[PDB]
Design a protein around this ligand. Structure first.
Ligand SMILES: O=C(O)CCNc1cc(Nc2ccc3[nH]c(=O)[nH]c3c2)c(Cl)cc1[N+](=O)[O-]
Length: 131
């Protein structure tokens, strides 16, 4: 699937961006070219620094710091919920946010810590609606 757009009339591929993420998530599943371990409450999550930086203000700041960009292990605040992190990491790699009544507060807190503004705002709206 392709279509035209812009004063260019440039060809755009509809599924290209989502296909790239699908493939990045496959690399993560197979531990191919992963270059960082994120440690949350003694659980370990392998990932790609570029994907993290593309989705999170916190990770953008870390991995653009000339000192911290060389670390292969990054520890998060030990009060961060690991399920909250796993939900957001999955979101980064898929566009899908598995928000539920039983996890929304943890996910929101985690998204605030990671500086994922669109997710925070979304959690706020869903909390607002249920009051
Ligand atoms: O059967 C295959 O081609 C292997 C399928 N698996 C796979 C494929 C890719 N990239 C890939 C490969 C060939 C392509 N030809 C294209 O036009 N685009 C392509 C993208 C990545 Cl990055 C991870 C995985 N993976 O880890 O599973």
């Amino acid at each position: 699937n392709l279509y035209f757009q812009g004063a260019d009339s440039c060809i755009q591929f509809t599924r290209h961006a989502s296909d790239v993420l699908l493939n990045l998530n496959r690399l993560r599943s197979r531990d191919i070219l992963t270059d960082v371990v994120i440690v949350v409450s003694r659980e370990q999550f392998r990932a790609h620094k570029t994907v993290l930086m593309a989705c999170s203000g916190l990770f953008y700041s870390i991995f653009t710091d000339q000192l911290k960009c060389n670390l292969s292990v990054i520890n998060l605040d030990p009060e961060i919920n690991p399920e909250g992190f796993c939900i957001l990491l999955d979101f980064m790699y898929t566009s899908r946010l598995n928000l539920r009544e039983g996890n929304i507060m943890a996910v929101m807190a985690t998204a605030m810590y990671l500086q994922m503004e669109h997710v925070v705002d979304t959690c706020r709206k869903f909390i607002k609606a249920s009051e």
